[PDB]
Every structure is written in C-alpha cells, then in structure tokens.
Amino acid sequence: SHTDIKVPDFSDYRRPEVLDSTKSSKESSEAR
Amino acid sequence: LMKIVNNAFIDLPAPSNISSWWNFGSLLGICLILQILTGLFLAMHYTSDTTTAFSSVTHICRDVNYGWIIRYMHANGASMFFICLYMHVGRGLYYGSYTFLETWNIGVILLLTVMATAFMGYVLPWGQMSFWGATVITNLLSAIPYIGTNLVEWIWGGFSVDKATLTRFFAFHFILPFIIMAIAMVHLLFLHETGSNNPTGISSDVDKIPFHPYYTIKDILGALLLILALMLLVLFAPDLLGDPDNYTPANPLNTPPHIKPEWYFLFAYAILRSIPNKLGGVLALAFSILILALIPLLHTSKQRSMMFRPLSQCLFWALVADLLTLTWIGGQPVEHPYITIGQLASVLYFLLILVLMPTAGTIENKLLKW
Amino acid sequence: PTLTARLYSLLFRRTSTFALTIVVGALFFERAFDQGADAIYEHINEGKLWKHIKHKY
Amino acid sequence: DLELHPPSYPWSHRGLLSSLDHTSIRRGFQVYKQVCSSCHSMDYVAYRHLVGVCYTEDEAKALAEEVEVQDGPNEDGEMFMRPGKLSDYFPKPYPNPEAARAANNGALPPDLSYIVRARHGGEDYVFSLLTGYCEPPTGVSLREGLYFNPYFPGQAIGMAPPIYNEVLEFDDGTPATMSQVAKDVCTFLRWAAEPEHDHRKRMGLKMLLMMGLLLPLVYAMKRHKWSVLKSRKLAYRPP
Amino acid sequence: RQFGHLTRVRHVITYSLSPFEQRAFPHYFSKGIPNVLRRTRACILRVAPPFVAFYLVYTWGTQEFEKSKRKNPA
Amino acid sequence: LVDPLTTVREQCEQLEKCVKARERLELCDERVSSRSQTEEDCTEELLDFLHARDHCVAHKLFNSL
Amino acid sequence: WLEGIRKWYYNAAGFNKLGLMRDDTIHENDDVKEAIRRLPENLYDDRVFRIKRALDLSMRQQILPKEQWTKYEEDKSYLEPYLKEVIRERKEREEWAK
Ligand code: HEC
Ligand code: HEM
Ligand code: HEM
Ligand SMILES: Cc1nc(CO)c(-c2ccc(Oc3cccc(OC(F)(F)F)c3)cc2)c(O)c1Cl
DSSP states (O other): OTTTOOOOOOTTTBOGGGOOTTSOSSSSTTTO | OGGGGGGTTSSOOBOSSOOSHHHHHHHHHHHHHHHHHHHHHHTTTOOSSHHHHHHHHHIIIIISTTHHHHHHHHHHHHHHHHHHHHHHHHHHHHHTGGGOHHHHHHHHHHHHHHHHHHHHHHHTTOOSSHHHHHHHHHHGGGGSSSSHHHHHHHHTTTTSOOHHHHHHHHHHHTTHHHHHHHHHHHHHHHHHTTOOOOSSOSOOGGGOBOSTTHHHHHHHHHHHHHHHHHHHHHHHOTTTTSOGGGGSOOOTTOOOSSOOOOGGGHHHHHHHHHOSSSHHHHHHHHHHHHHHHHGGGGOOSSSOOSTTOHHHHHHHHHHHHHHHHHHHHTTSOOOHHHHHHHHHHHHHHHHIIIIIHHHHHHHHHHHTTO | OOHHHHHIIIIISSHHHHHHHHHHHHHHHHHHHHHHHHHHHHHHTTTTSGGGGTTTO | OOOOOOOOOOOSSOSTTOOOOHHHHHHHHHHHHHTGGGTOOOOSOBGGGTBTTTBOHHHHHHHHHHSEEEEEEOTTSOEEEEEOOTTSBOOOSSSSHHHHHHTTTSOOOOOSSSTTTTSTTTHHHHHHHHTTOOOOOTTOOOOSSOBOOSSSGGGOBOOOOOOOTTSSOOSSOOOOOHHHHHHHHHHHHHHHTOTTHHHHHHHHHHHHHHHHHHHHHHHHHHHHHHHHHHSEEEOOOOO | OOTTSSOOOOSOOEEEOOSTTBOSSTTTTTTHHHHHHHHHHTTGGGTHHHHHHHHHHHHHHHHHHHHHHSOOOO | OOOHHHHHHHHHTTSHHHHHHHHHHHHHHHHHHTOSSOSOOTHHHHHHHHHHHHHHHHHHGGGTO | OOHHHHHHHHHHSSTTTTSOOTGGGOOOOHHHHHHHHHSOHHHHHHHHHHHHHHHHHHHHTOOOOTTTSOOGGGOOOOSHHHHHHHHHHHHHHHHTTO
C-alpha cells in the first residue's frame, strides 16, 4: 500500500556535497 | 488582461520527448524579426532607382557607421532562414506532422510567399545577376498561352525589366514579411487546438508539460547556435553563398557565361532545366512545391511516424540526396553528363513521393496485420 | 563557507542586488575584454596595423 | 576552351584573424595612380577613405590638391575646375565607357572597386592574371590589340601588358619588380572591396570568446532545468 | 486547451528531484558516449547509402565532365 | 634588376610533373606544327603544365617578398 | 519463407526497444479514439504506462535493457477485436445511407 512505497536512490545523480545521508543540508545549500 | 493569450506561450501543455529539431520551427520567429529589424535600418539608405541603387548599396557598405554589417546579417540571414525550413519541412514528413491538414497547407503558403519574396530581395541591388536572374525566372510565365506575354509585360511595366520593375518590387518586398508575420500567427492558431506532434506519433496528452522554463531556454540555445552560425558567415565568409557576380553593375547587353539564381532555388530550377520543353517543365516546378499539399491524401500506414518505419527511412533520406543533388546539378551548366542526371533525379523526386512512400505503408501495414 | 556561499547570501539572493551586480561586472568587463582582443589582435597582426606605422608619419 | 583555376596562394591576410599589411596597401596605391588610373574608372572610393589605413590626412589631402576636379556652378552660370579635396572620389579617367572603348580596341576596362569579389578567386586570379602573360602556344592566332593569357576566359584579352619590371619606383624604395608590385596592388584591391577587413576580424574575434564562453553556460542552464526530467523514475502500482 | 481535462490517468506514481540537489551533467562521458554509438548504429545504415552514392555522382559527374572538354585524337 | 619570380619558375621546371608535361607539350607542338591544316592547338597541354608549375610557385614565393 | 521477416521487421522498427507493443503506436483518428474509449480499465491503464515511459526514454534517447524488451510472440493484438467492431458499424452506417 502507500506504506510499501519507496523512493529510489539518485546517488548516481546527486551532487557530492549531499550523498552522505547521515549529514545535513543547509551547510552546502548556500553554496549549491 | 490580454496577456492570458500567452497561456499559449507560457503555461502551454507540450510534450517532454522533444528533440532539438523543433527549435528550427521556432527560429523563424527570430529570423523573421531579425531580418526585418536589420532590413529596416538597411532600407533607411536604399534607393528604389536604378542610377543610384548600386551606389546606394555601397553608400552603406563603405560610409555608414557599421552599415556594412547590416547588408550581411540580412543577406546571409535570409539563407539561414531557408536552412531551417528545409529541415523544418522535411521534419513533418519524417515525423508525420502533415496530418494536421489545417496546418500543413498553411506551411505551403508561407513558403510560396517567401520564394516570391526572396526573389524580389535578390534583384534590388542590380548585381548583373539580379537583372538576368529577374529575367530568367520572370520570363517563364510567358510560356502560358494567350496571357503570358500580357502578364509579363504587365509586371515588366512595359517590355523588359527597367527602373519601374525595380520599384514595383521594393514595395512588394518590404511588405510581405509582415504578411508572413501575420499568417505565421495563423499557422500557430490552428496548432493550438491540437498542440504539437511527437516524434513517435502518439498522443502524449498524458505527458504534456509547461513551456516557460523548458523549451524557452532550449529555443534560446537553439537561437544562440543560429547567431553563431550566422556571425561566422558575415564575419568570416560572406562571399560564400552569394554568387560573386552580384557586385557587378547590371547591363542588359552583357550576360555572364554561367547563370544561376541563388543556391536555394536550385532544387527546383534544375527541374525546369531538365525538361527541354518550356511550358511542360514549368508546371513541374509549381508542382514541385504544391505536391506538399498533395501528400496528406497519401498517408497509407495506420502509423504516423517514420521512427517506426525503417523501410520508409531508407526512402526518406534518399529524397534528401536527390534534393542535395538537384541543389547542385542546377548550379552547374547545361552539358551532357549532367542533363542525363536531371532527367533522372527530377523524376526521382516526383517518383519517391507519389509511388513508393505510400507503397511502404501499404506493405508495412501488411507486415503487421492491418 | 566557500566563496560561492559567501557570494550567494550577499548578492545572488536579493533580486534587487542581483541586477545591481551584473551591470557592475559588465561595466568593468567591457574595460577588460576590449583591451584583451585589441592587444591579441594587435599581437597577431604585429607589424601590420596603423598604430605600428604611426611614428614614421 | 578550358577555364583555369589559380592556386591557393598564401597572403598576409588569408588567415581567419589575419589582417592586411597596411604598408603593402601603401605602395599599392602608388601603382593605381602611376599606371592604372589612366583607364580604370574606380568611382566608389575617395581619398578620405585612405586616412587611417595607408596615408594620413595631410599626405592624402596633398593628392587631392594635386589633381583638378570639375565642381561648381559659377555665378556667371558656368562650371570650372578646382584642385580636388578629400571628399571628392577618385578622378575618373574617361567621362563614359564608350570613349574608353574608342580609346582602346573596342573593349572596356572594368572598374576595380569590387572586381576582386566579383571574379572567381579574386586576388589569386588577378595576381596570376598579370603574372601569366606568356608567348602564345602552337596553332593560336589572335587579332590586333588582343594578347594571350590563360586565366582570362576565352584566353583572348584586349589587355595591354600594364606592368613590367621597374615600370616605376616607389617611395621607401623597395624592389619594384613585377611581383612586388602585383602583391601591393592585389593587397590594395581587396581593401577597396572591403574597407571593413580590419574591423571584420575584431568582431570576428570578439564573437567566439563570448559565444564559446556563453554557449556552455547556456548549455548548463538548459541542463540545469531539464535535470528534473533527465532524472525521473516512474512506476505502476495498481491493486 | 490546458491542463485539467485532457485525458485520464490511474494508479501511476512520479518521482522527481530538484536540480539543486544534483549535478547538471552526470555521466556525460561515461554513459553518453556508448549511447551515442547505439544511437548511431541504429541510424547509419539507412542514412548514408544515398549520401554515399551522392559522393560518387559528385565524383563521376565532374570527372566525366572534365574529359568532355579535353580534345579527342582527331 | 631581376624578378624573384623567374628564379622560382626556373627551379620548378626541373620538377617531375613540370618536366613530364613539358615533354607532352613538345609532342603536341610538333604534332601541330608538322601538320598543315588543323583546327587544333596546344592550349590543351599548356594548362596542365602551368597548374603543375604554379603549385610550386605557390608554396614558397612569399618567403622572399 | 515469410514469417522469418515479420519477426525481423518487428525488431527493426524499434518499438520493442521501448517497452511498447504494436497497438500502442497507431495513428490516432476518430475510428481509433472510439476503441481506446471502449477499453477496460485493467488494460487501459496498461496502455498508458507503456507509453508514459517510452516517451521519457525517447526524451533521453535511451532504451530499456535487452531483457525488458518486447518479444514478437508476446505482441498481443489486444485492440483488434474492439477496432474491427467499429469499422463494421461505420460501413453499416454508410451503406445504409446509400
Ligand atoms: C592600357 C590601359 C590600362 C592599363 C594601363 C591598365 N589596364 Fe587593366 N584593363 C584595361 C582594359 C582596356 C581591360 C579590358 C580587358 C578585357 O576587356 O578583357 C582591362 C582589364 C583589367 C582587368 C579585368 C580582368 C578581367 O577579368 O577582365 C583587371 C583586373 C585589370 N585590368 C587590372 C589592371 C591592373 C592591375 C593594372 C596595372 C598593373 C591595369 N589594369 C592597368 C586597361 C588598362
Ligand atoms: C524573408 C524575407 C526576405 C528575404 C528572403 C529577402 C531577401 C534578400 C536578399 C537575398 C538580399 C541579398 C542582397 C545582397 O546580399 O546584396 C536582400 C537585400 C535587401 N533586402 Fe531583402 N529580403 C527579405 C526581407 C526584406 C526586408 C524585411 C527588408 C526590409 C525591412 C528588405 C530589404 C532589403 C533591401 C533594401 C535590400 C538591398 C540590400 C542588398 O541588396 O544588399 N528585405 N534581400
Ligand atoms: C516564417 C515561417 C514559419 C514560421 C514562423 C513557423 C512557425 C512554426 C512554429 C513556431 C511551430 C511550432 C514548432 C514546431 O512544431 O516544431 C511550427 C510548427 C509546424 N510548422 Fe512552421 N513555421 C513556418 C513555416 C512553415 C513551413 C514553410 C511549413 C511547411 C510545411 C511549416 C509547417 C509546420 C508544421 C506542419 C508544423 C507542425 C507542428 C508539429 O508537428 O508539432 N511551417 N511552425
Ligand atoms: C511546441 C511549440 N509550440 C509553440 C507555440 O505553440 C512554440 C512557439 C512559442 C512562441 C512563439 O512566439 C513567437 C516568438 C517570436 C516570434 C514569433 O513569430 C511571430 F511573432 F509570429 F512573428 C512567435 C511561437 C511559437 C514553440 O517554440 C514550440 Cl517548440
């Protein structure tokens, strides 16, 4: 159902600054 | 509030699977404005009289502050115009857009408007090919019976080209692009009731998207390459396409050995030149163009595109060759090696359209059982 | 912060500033690009231009 | 019977950023005056176009003061002659074409304003025209006045040989050989049919270093927006 | 015409990302150039051969034209 | 006083394509001159000599000038 | 021999390289819009998704891997019953008018 849904991983496409899911945004956002 | 019409140009639904081919469909909006913009400032100094015209060109090319550019942004710009067309026209064949019957027919009348405009645009400066190029093309209408001599004299203001026949064009010529500017809006209006026509041929209504961020910049990118491939000509090779003779003043008592109008007629001029008869070759010419109106009654495949018709692909690009041949074969004089090719190639043109492109879909329907 | 992020929050954030930035950069850019090409054009055509034969006459 | 293609000679200006050796324009102008200007009606130029290219204001103005020009309705109701000024075009040799045909063997000198761009090959033709006068071949006979030169169509021309070694002498004193003349003149004629060559290449150059610099950035700004949809996965999750 | 009454969709899901959260040109060299070839192999056969033949009729058309101007032994 | 050109034409008439066409020219030359009534000429062969010549004159001549 | 050619043409047209079927690519007209209106939900949405991804991949000029391609034996002719039903009514509607 709507819980079985899942988002794929665009880590083949992202910027390097954000690949680390453990980190946060907002420290490279202003640069991005 | 009338801005809401630009729902057409801002919030419009259009596909997402779109090539850079359709940029060519948009550049004419730029070329048409770019040409008029140039040509207007250009025509602040032109003169519609013989004795001063050719000087009145050189009045620009020499004395005017950066007036010399505007001749060539205009002239070669008029050629980058066509280079978009004969990719834009060949498109709908290869992607099946001619099915929009209300629109394709408009795509003719724009063309004939231009191919009678650009003609007028070559003759203004009296380049010794202007005159004879005006004579050769215009004289053909004399081939008609019982009215040919009357019309051509009527448009020659007399008995041959002279001061009057110049000025009858400079006004017929400085006006029509506006008639194109208007009819172009019609050419979009019938579209807006159906929208574009994807390469596949499928109604992509499920996957239509906006237009302000996406195809805008793409069109600019398309436009940017145009200006690039227009600045190169004017800056680095303006003498390339335009025949050199057009800098010679005009004299009816001296012809050049070789005559050809500007390069872009040549797919069509050659067709006439093939036929040794006078009249019976003419009606091939006008039919060499109006045949495009005859195509939609020859759409055989219950598919639309040619992306999914590999056989017709083999015949489509084949037609491009025959054009690229007839573009060149007319550009060369009348001698036995080439005449044997025009008798073939011109027939191939009519032949590929009216026999085999239908025949493919007649087959391809049957290879797949409908 | 990188230069980029320091550049963002100063200029490229407030649109009033973002237009002020561009004319500034353009106003100076006009002063460099001309000097560049005029010298490169001078350099590649060394011994050909009028200013190179401007002292004799 | 045949044409003749001149070769692809080098020049000081054949490159896509190569301008004209303005020095070479200088001596070439001397040639037009001592030699050509007795029969070549160059009308679409004036001495003022020579400023900032080959001569100065005073040196060029000296040449208009040299030759007389027909100008002015006198208050008596007549016309007279005065020394030329800068604004006057080149003194035309002959008042009309016919007298030029009568002062030759019926043939007419074409103008040299735009002859280079009006003749296939331009310089290479014109250079190899003057420097292609040769004794006729076997079996060929030619009327009086005419001469032989292969490059001209028909290989039969009413062109008296205009150049010969040390037909004149230049100012700085270079070797006035038949070739060095032919360079500086052909270098001149291109300028006649192109007073914009120097500036054509400047915007000729300024273009790329904008467009070559822009065109990627746009090509990023394109890809910056489309990247939403260059990267999109779909699905189909019915019951 | 506009968005809202075009046609029907049922039970379809869309996943899309900001641009800022991703590089503009990922794998431009890596995955593209093999895709250029595969794009190319699927068109080359039914695009060239006319243009190939043109190179020959631009070839023979000039050569056979050149000869005809050269004299004959007579 | 000498034209720099004639020095170069002289060096080039020794070259392969130049010499060979020169030989055909003389055979055309005798073929016609030995014949009495001919609408024929060596305008044919002369050109193949010259375009072969001027190609050498091309490559270098403005080293001197 | 024939049938070795239908299977080949169907591989050269391309439209097995995009997860599509044969009925998907048909020129849309009034005769066909009738049938696509007449289809059931389970098959109709199944038409949509086949198209909706082929477009996005004709955008990129990418394709599916060789495994997910379509196979000639699986080229189901799901539309033909619903279509020929129509043109029967059309010619019944015309000849009845004459
Ligand atoms: C004797 C007067 C006279 C002299 C001096 C003269 N010209 Fe000529 N020029 C003519 C005439 C007469 C023709 C006619 C040629 C023809 O009818 O084909 C002509 C033709 C030409 C042409 C036309 C080429 C073509 O294809 O017909 C050029 C270019 C030219 N001259 C350049 C020059 C140059 C360069 C010089 C100086 C080296 C020069 N002229 C000196 C009278 C002259
Ligand atoms: C599709 C529209 C048009 C076409 C195809 C066209 C065609 C041409 C061409 C081919 C030339 C070449 C002359 C040369 O290169 O020397 C020319 C010149 C000229 N154009 Fe047009 N033209 C068009 C519209 C216009 C417009 C819109 C104007 C004015 C606003 C204009 C005014 C002129 C004038 C006065 C000349 C003489 C300049 C010259 O001959 O160089 N034309 N035109
Ligand atoms: C000044 C002349 C023209 C202008 C300004 C113009 C403008 C346009 C534009 C903006 C489009 C939408 C872009 C696109 O669909 O690719 C278009 C589409 C089209 N044009 Fe042109 N056009 C011109 C000439 C022509 C000509 C000569 C033809 C000849 C047949 C033609 C036929 C078409 C067709 C069939 C379409 C269909 C669009 C589609 O298939 O989605 N147009 N035109
Ligand atoms: C699919 C598609 N559709 C449309 C309009 O429906 C357009 C499109 C968008 C904007 C247009 O407006 C213009 C812009 C400049 C000149 C122009 O000429 C003019 F004004 F009619 F002379 C029209 C004209 C066409 C387009 O570029 C594409 Cl790709």
